[PDB]
Structures are given as C-alpha cells and as structure tokens.
Amino acid sequence: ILSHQSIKNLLGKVILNYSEENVRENGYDLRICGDKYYELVQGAELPEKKATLREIEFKERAILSANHTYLFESCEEFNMPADLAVLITLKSTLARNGFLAPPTVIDAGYKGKVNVAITAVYNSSLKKGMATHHLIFLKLDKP
Amino acid sequence: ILSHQSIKNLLGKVILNYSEENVRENGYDLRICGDKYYELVQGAELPEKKATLREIEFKERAILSANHTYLFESCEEFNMPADLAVLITLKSTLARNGFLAPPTVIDAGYKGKVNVAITAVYNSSLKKGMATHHLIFLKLDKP
Amino acid sequence: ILSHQSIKNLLGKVILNYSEENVRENGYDLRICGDKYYELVQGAELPEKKATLREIEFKERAILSANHTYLFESCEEFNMPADLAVLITLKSTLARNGFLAPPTVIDAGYKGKVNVAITAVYNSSLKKGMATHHLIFLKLDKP
Secondary structure (H helix, E strand, C coil), X not given: CCCHHHHHCCECCCEECCCHHHECCCCEEEEEEEEEEEEEEECCEECCECCEEEEEECCCEEEECCCEEEEEEEEEEEEXXXXXXXXXXXXXXXXXXXXXXXXXXXXXXXXXXXXXEEEXXXXXXXXXXXXXXXXEEEECCCC | CXXXXXXXXXXXXXXXXXXXXXXXXXXXXXXXXXXXXXXXXXCCEECCECCEEEEEECCCEEEECCCEEEEEEEEEEEECCCCEEEEEEECXXXXXXXXXXXXXXECCCCEEEEEEEEEECCCEEEECCCEEEEEEEEECCCC | CCCHHHHHCCECXXXXXXXXXXXXXXXXXXXXXXXXXXXXEECCEECCECCEEEEEECCXXXXXXXXXXXXXXXXXXXXXXXXXXXXXXXXXXXXXXXXXXXXXXXXXXXXXXXXXXXXXCCCEEXXXXXXXXXXXXXXXXXX
C-alpha cells in the first residue's frame, strides 16, 4: 500500500483533477462531482438488463431517499499504470452516518473517471464536491 | 496483490472449478452456482442463533426481493495455502446495479467452496453462473 | 498483510484491550463492547449535519431493527504506528447472517477505539463482546 508521499507523486499523472488536501496518510479521498447524478429506480436483471436510472441535476446537494442506490461521477480522472490497482473503501464519516457502499477495485490499466454507487439507509444528502471514498493503492507483484 | 499472470498458475491448484476467462488483470472473478440458493427470511440473534433461511431452486436465474439477503455457493472451490489470503470485493457491475455485499476474506488454509451473501436493494435477478465477486489475492508476510 | 504470529506481537502495544483467541490466521477479530451503542434515527446532511443518534444501553445484547444503522464502540483500543494501516472487513458469520458493513480503514497514526457501523437487514441482535469484524493489517511502503 502506498503512503502519503508516494500518492503525492501520482497527482497530475495517475490521479487527475485532484485536490492536494485529499492526499491522506495512506490513501486518496475521492470526491463526487458532475452536472448530474443518478438514482436507480428499477432493479437490474444481470447480466442482460442493467438497472433503470433516473437522471438528476447535481446542483449543490444531492438528495437521497432511504433504500435507494445512487450513482455519482468522481471528480477525479484516473490513469492507472499496469503496475497499480486501487481498493475503493468508504470514508468513515459516511459509514458512521448511515451510508452503504460495497468494496470495489479500480484495476491496473484503467483509464477515466469512476462512477461510484452509494446506497442511502436514510433520507439524507451529500454535498457536491465532498470526499466520499478512501482510496487505497495496491501495487501488483508483476506489471 | 497477485497479477493476472500469477493467478493463472493458481488454476487447477488453488482455484478449482474455474473459468480461464475469469482471471482478470489483478484478480479472479468468482461465480455463483449450485442447484440451490438461500433467502434469509428471519433475522439472526448472534452468535447463538443463525438467520432463518428459505431454500430455493437455482434454475437459470435467481430472483431477489428488495431488502433481503441471499446466500449463493460459488462455482469455484478453493484450496488456500498457508501463504495466501483473499479479499472478496464486489464486481463493479453489481455495485452500480443495486446489489450490496460487505467485504470478507478467505483466509490462508481455507478449503472448499464459499457461500457469499448478496443483499438486493431492489427486486432484481442474477443469472446462474455469472460472475458476481472480484477476488484480490493477498500474500502473507509469513506462512 | 500481517500473519497470525505478527499480530500476536502487536498485542499490548498496537492493539490494547485484546483477546488472544481473536488473533486469526491473518487478521484480528474486533469485538463490540461499551456501556451503550447507538441507533441512527435521522439521516445525515453531510458534511455539515451528522446523522441523529439514539443512545441505547448496551447490556448483554444489542437489539437491531431492520433497515437501521447502528454504531458500536470497539473493545479494542488502537495505537497505530506510522507504517501500519488496517483494512476493516466484516466477519463472514455476520455477512452470511444478514448484516451489512462497508469497508473502512484505520489509518497510520490513529489512536483510540473505533466506532463501527453495522446495518441490520433484519430485526436481529448481536451479543455484547462478540467478534464482528475481521481486521487485516497493511504495511505502508514508507512510514
């Protein structure tokens, strides 16, 4: 796992559209952005049928209804080298305040922004541009 | 974490009943199989009382009700060395399509198939034999 | 990640108020304890407004209502070094028995007990002092 300093060298290269203060002791705190966010409104029948999304204008605050999953576009764009992978964990503040999210991975070689799924246990809200996820960088044994 | 190459040499030895296609850039995608799957219908009173399960025939597609947790047996059987461990994360497609799952680990020394717990946020379904989880291989500092 | 023996050497200094039996093959099993636990009753409006908590006496068992998130104080107190971090995952028994928890991390330098959030999918209960989470220790590339 990469330390605060090692992650700092990734800014502008591996992690684009970053925020310096978001580089933590041992990870980077991903933020949610975008002109819009999405609310899943009808279940998926995988793998053939994806869930039905309701598009919502992401103004200053995203309003979430209890028992619904929402998709957010990350502020950050990623350019993963075949040498690194990232474990996406949830920021503790979100976990302790009633938000759910499963663990997922940004695989080596991945390019682009990432869309994260946050499920609201209660009617609640998340501020646009706030940090929601704690990224842990893992190095592959072989590229 | 083991790369695609390292995981490939695990097939037939550490990962049985596998699919060569499921070996990813830095992980193996576990699949759900079995003649049956289970639905939790009554809550647990841990550790003394486990949750009450309803057994359901796993035909070709497993139907899930919103706000219920389901147990699926993996197609893959594991034979973990005292030198390796596995972090079970959720496949992104499942996360983004309204399925929840907590992070868990297959510890060194573990033998057998794994029963994974997927919680449905919406009435939905998952195809029998489809990939649902993204396995990351962790090597112990000492066997 | 750190192995069983490596975790034993952390008892008394990195992991306080521990239980020897809770040291596993490749992790430490955190326990829930404390005079009381908390039920989230009203959603959060992050980051400005945290979720509204209801304080509940934690006697011998913690009774949880379906679709509610609860905060538990860990028995264990941590004193993380500058080159060690912990990935908090859920014990498989809790996952398979209908309890949800998102992945979170105890960062290098962190000092104190941790409050974990468990979301109940069903009306259920958890015994005071029982193991709920499986801690995986990660070493930083640089302190």
